[PDB]
């Protein structure tokens, strides 16, 4: 990392241009150049890159990612004077505390709200249950009731949580990573309601961020679910919009997961002092936050003095009312696994690839561990057995595949299980995304597991199948490295799984 300057990473939906202006003031005052960048998948890139001591000096993201960053020792400890701490709301500091240490600066507080087109819908619906009938009305005029991003569990979670869904139960002073509320009766109800909106053609499974945004900002749909960052583009459109409380579901409020946008400092940064000066005395000020806010709205902010200005805005009170009805996201390392698990269940259920029950049962298993994967894919009959994950009976092809792939029967509470292809593939996909491997040679693998390559059990990172002697030799012969993932596990690619 270059010494004498600041590189800052922040997400593309945020006011990076405004932040750049703060960055130019810092430069005019100190002579230090600040470069603001908005890399795709920055939150996944940061941990790969920072582990080798590269990356940005400062990284911005909601607080939920930061526990994982801190655990891996990627973040500098933040030590602001008590005077400074007093400038921000206490709960925001709590969001960036990990094992008794402050690991980032809180910037702003974020919650989803219902955004609606006053001209098309002067009085927005109070319940999710009214949408179906309302959509029918609007379709008559070539419009739709509701579009929003269904690709990200962040947007669908408020509904899933409404009737009892939850991530980790908080108890005995800590989130209990073994008590996950992802396949309880309330989650199923909420996901079932969502899936029925899709079967009945009130929404498309394919809708993503860009598609819902365009549709709303061009007057084609009456409602959308988004955060404060989205308001700036609606302003610039012809749309006359309101911001209000999310609908209820079975008479219970929708429960958004509340994020605190936070700025962490790379442990490997040689510019820690400069980073702290920038953040404390330039960004976390009335003028600094306003510069960023004018670009893309921040939502409620952590800085008391400026939040007082922002609080007069009805869109902000609506933001805070939805926030009070939701929960502050946990920052524990297990959150990544939770988010991936739910993302997959929603995508699967919405396309009909799996039932709601199957999809949530798998999500439940994935959110609470990966011990099951290791048991199934141990180093190295299935017919009539169910899938460990989704609890559905293995078809006879999936039973065959379990055998040919050289899987191991998993016993849970006395019962024997295999895995269907869908759950197995989703699980391995999450492994690659959650544990970026480092490349290793055959020699490195042999040395690590005191065993010749022909005798090492190396599995395909896509299908879980045990690589043949020739498949392993392919890696060596053609200079294609193996992958060292978690627990010193070594993965490779079978002939069939050699993507372009
Ligand atoms: O879906 C897989 C996804 O899971 C995790 O992403 C979550 C974020 O960690 C979490 O903060 C939240 O992201 C939202 C931001 O808070 C908000 O400011 C704005 O940017 O919208 C974001 C949602 O798109 O929720 C997501 C889950 O949807 C994980 O960190 C990701 O790496 C992973 O891709
Ligand atoms: Zn399954
Ligand atoms: Zn394979």
Swiss-Prot record:
Single GO biological process annotation from the record: maltose transport
Localization per Swiss-Prot or TrEMBL: Periplasm
Classification via InterPro entries: Maltose/Cyclodextrin-bd, SBP, SBP_1_CS
UniProt KW Oxidoreductase keyword: no
SUPFAM superfamilies noted in UniProt: Periplasmic binding protein-like II
Keywords (A to Z) from UniProt: Periplasm, Signal, Sugar transport, Transport
Signal listed as a keyword: yes
Upregulating conditions: Induced by maltose and the transcriptional regulator MalT. Permanently repressed by cold shock in a PNPase-dependent fashion.
GO cellular component terms attached to this protein's record: ATP-binding cassette (ABC) transporter complex; ATP-binding cassette (ABC) transporter complex, substrate-binding subunit-containing; maltose transport complex; membrane; outer membrane-bounded periplasmic space; periplasmic space
GO molecular function: carbohydrate transmembrane transporter activity; maltose binding
Family: Belongs to the bacterial solute-binding protein 1 family.
Protein function: Part of the ABC transporter complex MalEFGK involved in maltose/maltodextrin import. Binds maltose and higher maltodextrins such as maltotriose.
UniProt xrefs under NCBIfam families: PRK09474.1
Subunit-structure text: The complex is composed of two ATP-binding proteins (MalK), two transmembrane proteins (MalG and MalF) and a solute-binding protein (MalE).
UniProt-recorded name of the protein: Maltose/maltodextrin-binding periplasmic protein
Origin species: Escherichia coli (strain K12)
């Amino acid at each position: 990392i270059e010494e004498g300057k600041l590189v800052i990473w922040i997400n593309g939906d945020k006011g990076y241009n405004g932040l750049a202006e703060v960055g130019k003031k810092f430069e005019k005052d100190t002579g230090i150049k600040v470069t603001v960048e908005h890399p795709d998948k920055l939150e996944e890139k940061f941990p790969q890159v920072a582990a080798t001591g590269d990356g940005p000096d400062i990284i911005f993201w909601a607080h939920d990612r930061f526990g994982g960053y801190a655990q891996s020792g990627l973040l500098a400890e933040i030590t602001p004077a008590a005077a400074f701490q007093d400038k921000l709301y206490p709960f925001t500091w709590d969001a960036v505390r990990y094992n008794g240490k402050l690991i980032a600066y809180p910037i702003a507080v974020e919650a989803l709200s219902l955004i609606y087109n006053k001209d098309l819908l002067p009085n927005p619906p109070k319940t999710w249950e009214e949408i179906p009938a309302l959509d029918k009305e609007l379709k008559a005029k070539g419009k739709s009731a509701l579009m929003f991003n269904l690709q990200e569990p962040y947007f669908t979670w408020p509904l899933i949580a409404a009737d009892g869904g939850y991530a980790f139960k908080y108890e005995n002073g800590k989130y209990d990573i073994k008590d996950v509320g992802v396949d309880n009766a309330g989650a199923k109800a909420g996901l079932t309601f969502l899936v029925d909106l899709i079967k009945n053609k009130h929404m498309n499974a394919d809708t993503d961020y860009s598609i819902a945004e365009a549709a709303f900002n061009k007057g084609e749909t009456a409602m959308t679910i988004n955060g404060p960052w989205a308001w700036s583009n609606i302003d610039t459109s012809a749309v006359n919009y309101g911001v209000t409380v999310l609908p209820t579901f079975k008479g219970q409020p929708s429960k958004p997961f509340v994020g605190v946008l936070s700025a962490g400092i790379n442990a490997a940064s040689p510019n820690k002092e400069l980073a702290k000066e920038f953040l404390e005395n330039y960004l976390l000020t009335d003028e600094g936050l306003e510069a960023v806010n004018k670009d893309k709205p921040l939502g409620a902010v952590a800085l008391k003095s400026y939040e007082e200005e922002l609080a007069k805005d009805p869109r902000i009170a609506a933001t805070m009312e939805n926030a009070q009805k939701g929960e502050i996201m946990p920052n524990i390392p297990q959150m990544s696994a939770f988010w991936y698990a739910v993302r997959t269940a929603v995508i699967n259920a919405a396309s009909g690839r799996q039932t709601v029950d199957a999809a949530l049962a798998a999500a439940q298993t994935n959110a609470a561990a990966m011990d099951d994967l290791d048991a199934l894919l141990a180093d190295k009959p299935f017919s009539g057995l169910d899938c460990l994950w989704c609890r559905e009976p293995l078809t006879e092809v999936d039973a065959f595949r379990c055998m040919v792939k050289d899987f191991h029967v998993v016993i849970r509470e006395g019962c024997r299980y295999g895995a269907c292809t869908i759950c197995l593939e989703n699980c391995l996909a999450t492994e690659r995304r959650l544990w970026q491997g480092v490349p290793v040679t055959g020699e490195e693998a042999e040395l690590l597991h005191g065993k010749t390559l022909d005798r090492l059990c190396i599995r395909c990172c896509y299908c879980g199948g045990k690589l043949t002697k020739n498949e392993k030799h392919r890696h060596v012969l053609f200079n294609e490295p193996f992958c060292k993932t978690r627990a010193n596990i070594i993965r490779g690619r079978c002939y069939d799984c050699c993507r372009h």
